[PDB]
Structures are given as structure tokens and as C-alpha cells.
């Protein structure tokens, strides 16, 4: 199918990669944090 | 995408399409700023 609704389907989907991609980030700034502790 | 599926349109009430949409809105704002909080912390520990 093709509807207005599938396009958002599609955006609720990148959100959740982005929410990996934070995790990933997040672990970097905590070993610079490690080597001021 | 495997999301973007006609199945999903179907399968969900409209009841449930709409609350998904208006959370993910708020989810996202918290997830860029904590990066940013974390990054803050780190300057603030070299204080």
C-alpha cells in the first residue's frame, strides 16, 4: 500500500537507530571521563 | 522500509498510530541531550 500514514511508519524507524547511535556516542565521552577521574 | 508496510496501517488503530507519533516527538529532544549533559559534565569535571 501508499498512504500518508507509511511515510511515518518510516520516520518512527530512524528515531530508534538514532537511540543506538546516542548510546555510542554517549560511551566515547565516558572514556575521555574515565582518563579525568 | 519494513516499517513503512501497508500491514502495520491495518494491523494498529488509529487510536494507537496517534500516540506512537506524539511520543517519539519528545523522545528524540531527550536523546540529542544527553550527549550534550554528559559532554557539559565532562567540562565541568576538569573544574
Given at each position: 500500500?501508499?498512504?500518508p500514514r507509511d511515510?511515518?511508519?518510516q520516520d518512527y524507524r530512524k528515531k530508534?537507530?538514532?537511540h543506538k547511535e546516542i548510546d555510542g556516542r554517549l560511551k566515547?565521552?565516558?572514556?575521555?571521563?574515565?582518563?579525568?577521574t | 522500509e519494513q516499517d513503512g508496510i501497508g500491514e502495520e496501517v491495518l494491523k494498529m488503530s488509529t487510536?494507537?498510530?496517534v500516540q506512537r507519533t506524539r511520543l517519539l516527538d519528545s523522545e528524540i529532544k531527550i536523546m540529542k541531550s544527553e550527549v550534550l549533559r554528559v559532554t557539559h559534565?565532562?567540562?565541568?569535571?576538569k573544574d
Amino acid at each position: 500500500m501508499a498512504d500518508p500514514r507509511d511515510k511515518a511508519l518510516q520516520d518512527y524507524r530512524k528515531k530508534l537507530l538514532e537511540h543506538k547511535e546516542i548510546d555510542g556516542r554517549l560511551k566515547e565521552l565516558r572514556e575521555q571521563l574515565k582518563e579525568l577521574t | 522500509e519494513q516499517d513503512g508496510i501497508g500491514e502495520e496501517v491495518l494491523k494498529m488503530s488509529t487510536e494507537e498510530i496517534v500516540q506512537r507519533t506524539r511520543l517519539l516527538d519528545s523522545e528524540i529532544k531527550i536523546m540529542k541531550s544527553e550527549v550534550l549533559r554528559v559532554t557539559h559534565e565532562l567540562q565541568a569535571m576538569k573544574d
